[PDB]
Amino acid sequence: TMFPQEARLRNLTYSSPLYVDMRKEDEE
Amino acid sequence: TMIYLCADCGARNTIQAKEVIRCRECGHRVMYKMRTKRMVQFEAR
């Protein structure tokens, strides 16, 4: 995980990933 | 090559040119640089 501001200087962007449950059919 | 120092631990990382930036007995991946010797001329004004 990120620990800013120990980040920043690594010119790192401070985001998190999105996870959306997608439906195609296999119950889950 | 030279020595480097970590942001947290500070232990001597003494790591080699062109490799991977990190530490040894711990974690995190940054590092600053030891101050030179170095008796430096400083006026008191």
Instruction: Name all domains of chain B by residue range, CATH numbers in brackets.
Output: 1-45 (2.20.28.30)
B30 in contact with A at a CB cutoff of 8 Å? Answer: yes
Among candidates B29, B31, B27, B26, which has minimal Cα distance to B6?
B31
Chain A's closest residue to B7, CA to CA, is A6
d(CA A5, CA A10): 10
Supply B33's token pair.
């640089």
SS3 A21: coil
Residue B12, beta-bridge partner list: B5
Residue B12: helix, strand or coil by DSSP? Answer: strand
* Resolution given for this structure, in angstroms: 7.8
Phi-psi map region of B7: left, alpha, beta (phi>0 left; psi -120 to 50 alpha):
alpha
Distance from CA of A5 to the nearest CA of B (A): 12
Backbone angles phi, psi at B32, to 5 degrees: -100, -165
